[PDB]
Design a protein around this ligand. Structure first.
Ligand SMILES: CN(C)CCSCc1cc(N)cc2c(=O)[nH]c(N)nc12
Ligand SMILES: CN(C)CCSCc1cc(N)cc2c(=O)[nH]c(N)nc12
Ligand SMILES: [Zn+2]
Ligand SMILES: [Zn+2]
Lengths: 369, 369
């Protein structure tokens, strides 16, 4: 296959469905990327992740540069070989999380490990290098976190810095032969909720040129209405012939709405994180399996779900497992949830290909809520 | 198949290898039974347990009578259906653990739940009933725990009580039509380390008549030498044409030695428990994967092991996972360890069938240590 090739097969309104061809495999869009925090999709073997339908996973950079270490993973053969996943892997730049889980300057960010307190410097150049050492297929540009709420000037400065960092990410990426020829680079749009800033960011990104464009700075507490409002005018600013990636957005209803507004890629820990809290997704809305009303419920988590969990075990059993704090509980809940998400993406892709996505969205919401 | 049929195909010294035919399947002996504490073999799907080679698992009665509840499991269709394991399941009587994890009388034992402090009474009659409600294939007689060390009189009294309880277990079991016709009953020998008491217990048990005989009261802190000493004269006291079950014994070297002394069945949490502590079994002895020397070791846990874990992941990866406290770490370590144990039982069975077990034991110990 080629290094990177995105083609759109069908459209409906702002929605698109197509594929991204990469050396390690094909990615069907809109796509949902399970998240791999510590070089592992929480409680699942790679084969199980793949069995649910995932074509690509997100590698958690922040934790990996610390715990095992980028250099160590490279010595060991790279992330794909290390964890046993031979398909595409997208890695975030790490900077954002650092400014969450610090001394920030125009050159990067200095911080102390949340594990052993060690000091570390992370710059656009170092982020690209780390993602290269990890063997990432889709590399994210190193950007700066914009607090929410954010004033116009504060949002502008941070966005302007991110654009300067984007150019540096681009060059660092292109200066590394092996990486520029086998991996792809995604730029990240910033600008908070301000249209003029989003437009400036988009033009700067397009001027630099990337393989994909992400809408960053959202899902930071602005509520769905505001997020959708921002997506309405933000996504159209991005090049139409390249993938549109909404970072950190995963609630089913968020995904459906984001796709209606032109988003092609998603990632969220919610599926796996909710795979211990007791939250299981169903087409009739989410349920907390720990609730007493499920103690003797013999039905599967979801009446229609096709995943292996819904074929073999009952809510009553999973209920017991979660309340007993058993590992198998997390395993089954996580497999189901991730399978549910992939099934959601499949229905979205099919409905768009068949020109009935808008109706699907309406039917989905009516029942889900 | 029949309700219960044990036949010996080969022998060598006191060692035997054969099969136990039961309605839900065949059990190859000597056999190792993975332990299922809360209606789940820790961190493994039933299919994975079976894939490692296990023909039967041990259902943890104590925890089940409390957490989900015997009556509830029966209402839900029984343990096999509940957890997704359709093969034989052996259940302990619960009494022993109660006197561990209390008011004791000739009628049974009164205790407070280690979960919510609730009060509960457990008698021979109630234990048999609970195992019936769980749908157990091999039911253990309700016996009394004999402290260690134990004086002759204290050991005699407790043993005499256990024998009275064994008769009651037998009758309660036979009075329940469905259970007596589809399940088997195992009596448990007691008597601490005293030969005369072990002989009395054995004669009483044989007088009552059971489908199998367990050597209880061992592995309570007496050390391997003493345990083996007790097994030397204890096992021969048991009927030769019925299975000999050593409860709570699982270290590889213990198993090999016990088989040389006539034991056909084993169970131990060590395999799974050591599947979080970082202990992985190898033919060169156990290793603690958390040790720094494994951080960049690309070799599998064991150079010869045939399990799926050793085919796909490295020590370095499992090392990272365990130190990061990831669930997958426990999953992989547990699958390997249980697979290692089943491989051990296979080698023992084959070596006996081929009349070279004694040599295998010698070769095993030389390398393992
Ligand atoms: C723990 N995860 C849920 C979050 C990991 S960081 C992923 C992430 C999430 C969100 N909401 C916005 C952004 C953004 O604007 N830039 C970058 N680089 N990453 C982001
Ligand atoms: C937690 N497990 C390791 C132990 C569960 S109790 C199993 C168990 C273990 C041992 N060592 C001896 C005996 C015994 O003499 N009688 C009974 N009924 N059970 C026993
Ligand atoms: Zn499901
Ligand atoms: Zn192995």
């Amino acid at each position: 296959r080629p290094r990177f090739s995105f083609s759109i097969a069908a459209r409906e309104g702002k929605a698109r469905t197509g594929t991204i061809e990469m050396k390690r495999g094909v990615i069907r869009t809109p796509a949902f990327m399970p998240v791999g925090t510590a070089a592992t999709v929480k409680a699942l073997k790679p084969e199980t992740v793949r069995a649910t339908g995932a074509d690509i996973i997100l590698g958690n950079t922040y934790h990996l540069m610390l715990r095992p270490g980028a250099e160590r993973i490279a010595k060991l053969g790279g992330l794909h070989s290390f964890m046993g996943w031979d398909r595409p892997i997208l890695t975030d730049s790490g900077g954002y999380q650092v400014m969450s889980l610090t001394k920030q300057s125009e050159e990067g960010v200095t911080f102390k490990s949340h594990l052993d307190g060690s000091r570390h410097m992370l710059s656009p150049e170092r982020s690209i290098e780390i993602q290269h050492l990890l063997g990432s297929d889709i590399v994210m540009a190193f950007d700066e976190c914009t607090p929410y709420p954010a004033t116009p000037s504060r949002a502008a400065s941070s966005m302007e810095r991110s654009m300067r960092w984007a150019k540096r990410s681009r060059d660092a990426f292109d200066s590394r032969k092996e990486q520029a020829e086998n991996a792809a680079l995604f730029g990240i749009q910033q600008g908070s909720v301000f249209e003029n800033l989003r437009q400036q960011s988009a033009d700067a990104l397009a001027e630099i040129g990337f393989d994909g464009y992400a809408v960053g700075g959202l899902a930071v507490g602005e509520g769905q209405d505001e997020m959708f409002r921002v997506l309405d005018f933000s996504v159209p600013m991005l090049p139409d012939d390249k993938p549109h990636y909404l970072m950190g957005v995963g609630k089913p209803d968020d995904i459906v709405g984001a796709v209606e507004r032109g988003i092609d890629m998603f990632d969220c820990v919610l599926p796996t994180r909710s795979g211990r809290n007791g939250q299981a997704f169903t087409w009739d809305g989410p349920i907390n399996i720990r609730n007493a009303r499920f103690s003797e419920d013999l039905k599967p988590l979801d009446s229609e779900c096709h995943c292996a969990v819904c074929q073999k075990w009952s809510r009553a059993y999973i209920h017991h497992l979660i309340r007993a704090g058993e590992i198998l509980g997390a395993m089954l809940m996580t497999e189901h949830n991730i399978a549910f998400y992939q099934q959601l993406m499949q229905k979205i892709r099919d409905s768009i290909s068949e020109g009935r996505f808008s109706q699907f969205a309406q039917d989905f919401r009516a029942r889900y809520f």
